[PDB]
Design a protein around this ligand. Sequence first.
Ligand code: CL
Ligand code: CL
Lengths: 665, 665
Amino acid sequence: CSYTVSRPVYSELAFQQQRERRLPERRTLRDSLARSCSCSRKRAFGVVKTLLPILDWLPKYRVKEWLLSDIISGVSTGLVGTLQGMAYALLAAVPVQFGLYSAFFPILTYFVFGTSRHISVGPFPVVSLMVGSVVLSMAPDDHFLVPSGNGSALNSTTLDTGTRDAARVLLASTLTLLVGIIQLVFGGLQIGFIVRYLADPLVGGFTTAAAFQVLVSQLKIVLNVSTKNYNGILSIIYTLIEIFQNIGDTNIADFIAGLLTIIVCMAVKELNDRFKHRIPVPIPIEVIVTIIATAISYGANLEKNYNAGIVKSIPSGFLPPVLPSVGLFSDMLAASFSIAVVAYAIAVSVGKVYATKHDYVIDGNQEFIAFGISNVFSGFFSCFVATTALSRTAVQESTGGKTQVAGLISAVIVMVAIVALGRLLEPLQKSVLAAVVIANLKGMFMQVCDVPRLWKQNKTDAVIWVFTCIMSIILGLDLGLLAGLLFALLTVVLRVQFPSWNGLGSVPSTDIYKSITHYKNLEEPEGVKILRFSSPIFYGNVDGFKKCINSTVGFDAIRVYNKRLKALRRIQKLIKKGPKVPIHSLVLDCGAVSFLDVVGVRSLRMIVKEFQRIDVNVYFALLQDDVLEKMEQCGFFDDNIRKDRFFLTVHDAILHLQNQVKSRE
Amino acid sequence: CSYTVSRPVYSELAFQQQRERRLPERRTLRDSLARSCSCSRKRAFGVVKTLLPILDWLPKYRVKEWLLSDIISGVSTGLVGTLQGMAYALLAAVPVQFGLYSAFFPILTYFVFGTSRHISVGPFPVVSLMVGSVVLSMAPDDHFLVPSGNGSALNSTTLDTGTRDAARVLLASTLTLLVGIIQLVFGGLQIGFIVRYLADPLVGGFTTAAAFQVLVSQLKIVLNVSTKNYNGILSIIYTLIEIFQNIGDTNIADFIAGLLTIIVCMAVKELNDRFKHRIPVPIPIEVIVTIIATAISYGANLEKNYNAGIVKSIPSGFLPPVLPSVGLFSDMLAASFSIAVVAYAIAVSVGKVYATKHDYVIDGNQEFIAFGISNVFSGFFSCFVATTALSRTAVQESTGGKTQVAGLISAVIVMVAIVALGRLLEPLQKSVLAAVVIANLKGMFMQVCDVPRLWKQNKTDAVIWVFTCIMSIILGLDLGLLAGLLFALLTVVLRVQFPSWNGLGSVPSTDIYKSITHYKNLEEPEGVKILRFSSPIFYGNVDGFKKCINSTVGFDAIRVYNKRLKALRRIQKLIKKGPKVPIHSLVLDCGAVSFLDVVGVRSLRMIVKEFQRIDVNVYFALLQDDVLEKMEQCGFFDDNIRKDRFFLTVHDAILHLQNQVKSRE
Ligand SMILES: [Cl-]
Ligand SMILES: [Cl-]
């Protein structure tokens, strides 16, 4: 209603005298470390419940209908997960059975350490692509050609199918172990803010580039062509050029089958997504299309007659655990860091989505620890890095999922698919498994449709999306992530280095101050010049602050003093022989400052000194308490620059100046 | 005196209606480029006067009194320049002949393009070290040993004295040209803010740690030992251990003569600096100690009898210009960027010191063009990077210097020191030249005495100093600079990611709001909770902003709504069978925000949504005009979240709530 106040003009000291402060809390390092480590059983029970969240959702079960919901979600997600694992096994250059292995053990491990309920841990297209890329870069194909086979002219250097898969599996296991170690280090040290740097446009561009590279790889697999494992800089462009040059050496049957299953899967998925109001449970198109592909490929001998590319390499059994070949962490540390951070980011995103959809809370450090333990346990069983696919996750959520029991049942399907089920999958073409991956790329390919939206929105974030999407295409995929985080931090620094300063003026008959570049009917005080500067002054925006002051006052505090001294020597010689007109004061509305960066408080004191010589007072308006306490420690309040120069509000400085002019002409 | 106002409670729309805004300026890209490129004669005269500042101070000269002060300072700095020029040549692994070339040619170029008057362009100890650092790595000693000389058992692979220097000289010429190009790029593209990242602790810790590497490198010449040109990681640490292992192979003639001039030069310099009130002109101790060293070394045959290390390689002549060996810019791009940025940083640092004392303004972007052409012109005459030494600069200023005429006269002394003078410096020991450099290291060695001062001051800047000083010792010297620039920018991100949020309360009978953790007698409104959050919300601190709200209200907006649904299912079944107590509203005092980072503004709309369901209003207090215009563009003002939720001041949000509850119970 009515905003009326009546108080004296407390600038800095008229308010600090009669206001008793609170004594700061004593450090007492010994008592701090003693009180932190609790001794009562309550803290122990709390950390046990937090570290192992399985003991929370288990006692409060609702078996009656939860059993049926979990068993149906488990069989469905198990089928989907074994299909996605045997499909993504090609993305990591590993055999098919190791995909099923990586789809079984991480599920078992993410049961006594996970803190979620609607997450299906398993393989992931982006993570498997990164694993395959780093394996190809660390173990290419031109390093295994054994000369044997009595060739035509030179030694028969044929393909090394065989022991090469063992080396690739050992490399993938070492990579998974290093990723798990990095995740456990990040979780134990309670450092979780390191993944906050992955902004939405950054991860969007990264996923778009990863989807492009996955499309290129799966198109290479469908066409059944052999490239030269180009990796490094412009690897995707090089392999695409090589594919376009090797179009003649394709397979017509494999290409036709792949295009047909792509069209069928895309049409069925679009029909199920659009017409959701008629069929709530998503039709498992992957399962039926894989079954019909295996049925068609088994009838006619596509391997011999049509020379199709089938798997025919399923051992259908387990294997004893193998110790990882430790010693390759130095050359894969950055790759493992990138894989771990992107996996954790995707996992946290999916968890937060499916948690705010179901209204429950998911811890971050607990998810980090759970995924680290899962990757470590997978490294001992010849598996790759595990994550949560958005397509596989939606299955247990749509079909009905309440706890991780549906996830544990999803491993039983993979369990029976490791030992017995799988012999019918022998004549399955590799182009069919390479197609569902492309069909799942529709979710990430549509992410490009937000760049025009981000351009109308904050434009700095629209540049981060395009920069990350392009830079993660030229120089690899893992190196493109590091070039995105650094670019995002640089963009953040540029937004606090080049602020939006204004020409704050006074609104008549009130005390609210608005910018002069936005409103017209604003009257500024006679002689006084007000200035606001956001983005607290640090070592980078000090010259910017100087230029802003020089632009808002009209002149320069240095050149005016130089001209005054040049005109003063003419006065000291006349006795022997015989600009700063409008600016009366400068009120700095430094209310948007947080830190001071003493390198900057030195420049502030220099400004106050330079303007004092030309008889121009530099008052402050909205200096915070935690900023004044910092400036006082940095040696700013000398015998001449007292606290009376600072004020509490913007109108207090103007009122004090008006009263000083009225009382002193 | 009296601060009293009387205005209605204009929240956001009660103020926006009757306040007509100013129309934004039209872009008009066609006219923007036309109005920028002016055609009048004033624009042509302005660019020529700025690019060539010689036409300014030359017409208004004061030959009557200025020429007398320049002729005495020119011959003074000419003797100091020819000695420091040839002494710093040892730090660049080039012969002593090319040291004088870097003291004559850059002065000629920095005469028609320079925009300063008290700067003596020439070599520099820190800059010449970075130049010589890459020469040892790109052209080591073990790459030129020719087997010849009928050795004892194997081929006589002795030293390659002779054409070995030609590989280092041509390498230094290409490095000098690449540095000059980078400086012209920064000056041509008008990008000068890139050197603002070199903060005071950053450049302070860098020059301090560089003084150690200069001390270790020059100590090798004093002791006259031969190391294994260790470069890379821990280069200073590795070469320091090898010196201690090679103490037995020292030279008593070079050590005694080297240690003697160290004490003499240090004592006279310290004595003249303290007792300045008796002798204003600094005594050239560097010059007098060199002349007496050559006289003693010429009398007794120290080269033959005492086996001392002398130069004896001065041809005393010029050479035709040699085209730089283009093709080495690819492997020296990262190295030249570190040298080009420190050559400009020290130039402006020393320049601005002698500029505020003489009250003349030095152009910023012009120094990039001035030193840019200087290094390019020096590359065509086999020179290294040119800079301005603080010791050599103080000579021409203390003895009397007004313009660059004293610098041009200083080049005349160097001019005669190449054609005629120089033969007397033949028996000069290399330990004497390597000692005057160590004596000048006192200025940088005393920079360590500011770390306890910076610790009592802003502690984040004290960490950057120690981090830069340590990191520039482990991984080289040029790589340590890049590790300091990234760490300094990272510290800025950490200061805006972890802000200093408070519990803002109300002062009785007034309208000023202060933090509750700093003052005691502050009364908060009944039910209302106020929160201030500096460091504008971006993608990194958006999660910390959630934890900040949950900490100031006591509860969580998510778990409370979850328990409400858990308690609501018991209500919908009872009809079939038969927390948020204190927080009434939340006033966010977002007055210290500058940008939005729409990635983070999506959470602001989510926060209002999460609190609206639990019947908790989230009001804003001090949203700026340029930030409110950003929310509307980012899609924040929907049909439910109107502008009435925002307020102009902090007290307007509280005054509105007091009247709302009073009129609506
Ligand atoms: Cl997916
Ligand atoms: Cl010096």
